[PDB]
Design a protein around this ligand. Sequence first.
Ligand SMILES: C=Cc1c(/C=c2\[nH]/c(=C\C3=NC(=O)C(CCC(=O)O)=C3C)c(C=C)c2C)[nH]c(/C=C2\NC(=O)C(CCC(=O)O)=C2C)c1C
Ligand SMILES: C=Cc1c(/C=c2\[nH]/c(=C\C3=NC(=O)C(CCC(=O)O)=C3C)c(C=C)c2C)[nH]c(/C=C2\NC(=O)C(CCC(=O)O)=C2C)c1C
Ligand SMILES: C=Cc1c(/C=c2\[nH]/c(=C\C3=NC(=O)C(CCC(=O)O)=C3C)c(C=C)c2C)[nH]c(/C=C2\NC(=O)C(CCC(=O)O)=C2C)c1C
Ligand SMILES: C=Cc1c(/C=c2\[nH]/c(=C\C3=NC(=O)C(CCC(=O)O)=C3C)c(C=C)c2C)[nH]c(/C=C2\NC(=O)C(CCC(=O)O)=C2C)c1C
Lengths: 173, 173, 173, 173
Amino acid sequence: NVYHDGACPEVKPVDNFDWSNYHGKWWEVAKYPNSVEKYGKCGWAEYTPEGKSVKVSNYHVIHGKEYFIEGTAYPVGDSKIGKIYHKLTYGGVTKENVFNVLSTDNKNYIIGYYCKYDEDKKGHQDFVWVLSRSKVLTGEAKTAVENYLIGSPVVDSQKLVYSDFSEAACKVN
Amino acid sequence: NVYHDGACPEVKPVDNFDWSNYHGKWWEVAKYPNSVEKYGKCGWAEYTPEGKSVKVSNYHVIHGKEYFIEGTAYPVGDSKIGKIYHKLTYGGVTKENVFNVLSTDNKNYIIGYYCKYDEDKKGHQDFVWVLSRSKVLTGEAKTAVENYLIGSPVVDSQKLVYSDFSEAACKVN
Amino acid sequence: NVYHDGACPEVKPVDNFDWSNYHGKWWEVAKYPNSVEKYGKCGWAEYTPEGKSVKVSNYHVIHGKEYFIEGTAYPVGDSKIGKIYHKLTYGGVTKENVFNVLSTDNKNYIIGYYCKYDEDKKGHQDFVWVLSRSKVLTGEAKTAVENYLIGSPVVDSQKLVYSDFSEAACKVN
Amino acid sequence: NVYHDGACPEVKPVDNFDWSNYHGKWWEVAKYPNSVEKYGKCGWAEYTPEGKSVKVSNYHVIHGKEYFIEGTAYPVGDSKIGKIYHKLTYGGVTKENVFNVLSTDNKNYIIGYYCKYDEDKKGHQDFVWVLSRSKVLTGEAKTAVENYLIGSPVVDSQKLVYSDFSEAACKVN
Ligand SMILES: C=Cc1c(/C=c2\[nH]/c(=C\C3=NC(=O)C(CCC(=O)O)=C3C)c(C=C)c2C)[nH]c(/C=C2\NC(=O)C(CCC(=O)O)=C2C)c1C
Ligand SMILES: C=Cc1c(/C=c2\[nH]/c(=C\C3=NC(=O)C(CCC(=O)O)=C3C)c(C=C)c2C)[nH]c(/C=C2\NC(=O)C(CCC(=O)O)=C2C)c1C
Ligand SMILES: C=Cc1c(/C=c2\[nH]/c(=C\C3=NC(=O)C(CCC(=O)O)=C3C)c(C=C)c2C)[nH]c(/C=C2\NC(=O)C(CCC(=O)O)=C2C)c1C
Ligand SMILES: C=Cc1c(/C=c2\[nH]/c(=C\C3=NC(=O)C(CCC(=O)O)=C3C)c(C=C)c2C)[nH]c(/C=C2\NC(=O)C(CCC(=O)O)=C2C)c1C
């Protein structure tokens, strides 16, 4: 889990988000570690569209067993601004969590960020995911991701943990 | 927070621990991040000997405000072996958590490990602290710590975060 | 610069090195600092295969000006064994310096070590490079470089300095 | 060796320097590594007044053998201001090098800094020494050293290397 002092940074999302492409199975190729996804392997997100909204379900495997959450996702304002609410319930509190699409090709990959702010302690936790339609980044998508990561003012490439997509890791029994 | 798969690893504690030095104020010079201490600055532990035991108090400061837990510590067996129970209560459950002393000069520094196992997920969380009687490592202590870190089978120094002992950080109001 | 007392340590190279992949452009993702590359950013190596040998060109960029050296590398013995001579001239003097490939995937990354021994002062300087066909370590190659760095007796990951591959740093006129 | 891009930092020397006390024998308790002092142990300096100047002799010991340089030191202006010229020869070139006294008690210790700028590369090398009358810092002096290092804009405590004052380190054959 990646903590910092202070408020959530001012982040600039993509201005050209293609809401059409937001569907299907996205593999979580990397992330910053977090407590909810603790121990999880072979992670993915599954987006099923309903207009300018999507039904969300996020899965991962731990030792042969599948775990998931369901929720819904829709743009905060204009579909083209890469800022999307993901409405999930944690701890019996349901909140609209702003996912920011920092980088995308509207085809193969998403690099997105969520910041959880603590008012009482005046700090925040950073959550980052690299979601891809492929278990492995190749070619242009991989090239795009690298160049983003090298300039990124928000994402620390070192802190990224890359998911295991072994058949062993991915097995549900 | 540092997560790995599998049960808690077997570690070798120091076999020459001087329990009589185990008192006084020990600054948290560095640690693996964990959720209980998120956003805290200027941490320290204070061990107040009570013959057999020591009373434990662990502090930090967040934005002029002090937070703490109190507990009790005692050797798991032979006092010269670097296995010390720390009896703390979290979430209404009281546990005798084993703290392994991985390296120490028996005067200025102590490098310690606690492993938290998840029986359901067949994985564990690693907790590491570098404790020092001075806010900054100097002389032989600094060298000893450096060298241990570099050889350690358990501690990945690259996951250490060193504390903020600024005047401002430490200011309590 | 990383100095240690005593002779060069006995390192264990890879015994499955694939000479046939020793070509192309290998970004200097990290190194131990040394005097010759001081100030240089965006560094790379270029290995031009000439069959038995390779032509070596090592570059970096300092303030829009590009600096480099050229040499020749060829295996110290058996191709499969991860010891390569790098024949370079410094101080009007051509040596055949042994580069030890400590870890590799024979595809994306290479972790290498050269040790410069001072006979008169019975000390040595350590040279470590982390080389990759991409400017940012991603996926399995990232995991593999980390997990090596953690277990390595030779390399202290805390003495690594990661290169800057920003557009600005890589800008040459 | 500690290298940075850019011009030398603006540094604030002590304005209460006691030139009278800048005499006699000072151990080098710590430094930033540098190439001149490569492999050296048990190092010390000796200042021998000659009027408004002091004659300088800097020593260390490498495997029973003694190595040294001589030169002269005198103030840049007013002796109350801790910037001192240290006139030494290296590479057949004799230069006046500014040594800035960042912190001192004028009794036990001195923390000093020299910055070596590369005009060609537009970068600089940092040189930091922690001098003391005593081979081990203790008491108020230690505390003074610790405190300075907590807030120091220039000196990184982690980059200090602490000299070896073992009799074996100090033994001259
Ligand atoms: C494919 C990416 C992805 C993902 C992403 C994700 N989560 C989000 C939201 C959050 N994730 C989090 O972990 C928290 C909780 C923060 C907190 O309150 O602790 C939030 C809000 C957002 C955008 C806001 C996104 C894109 N989340 C998961 C995984 C999961 N998230 C879960 O809640 C579970 C079930 C855990 C269990 O019941 O044991 C899984 C597997 C995956 C695999
Ligand atoms: C000086 C070192 C040190 C430390 C040490 C410490 N904690 C220990 C134990 C634990 N810490 C933890 O965070 C958990 C896991 C609790 C859980 O189950 O989530 C355990 C068992 C152990 C013994 C192994 C040790 C040495 N612990 C702290 C700090 C703290 N630990 C605390 O519980 C709090 C209270 C936070 C609050 O009330 O909001 C502080 C400040 C410091 C500053
Ligand atoms: C991508 C990795 C890499 C590299 C690698 C490298 N160098 C090596 C060799 C050495 N480097 C050194 O610095 C010395 C010691 C020279 C000495 O001081 O005697 C040697 C032998 C070896 C072989 C083990 C390897 C793999 N070397 C460089 C960079 C350079 N090496 C150079 O000599 C120069 C030109 C400096 C100038 O003209 O001002 C550059 C840019 C890069 C960027
Ligand atoms: C007690 C502290 C101290 C010290 C200090 C020192 N050096 C200074 C100067 C420099 N040191 C350096 O290494 C260089 C050389 C920069 C260059 O390489 O051009 C400079 C100018 C300055 C003031 C700026 C100070 C206070 N310098 C030494 C040690 C030495 N300095 C030496 O030149 C040698 C002889 C090396 C040999 O003959 O092989 C020793 C032992 C000690 C032990």
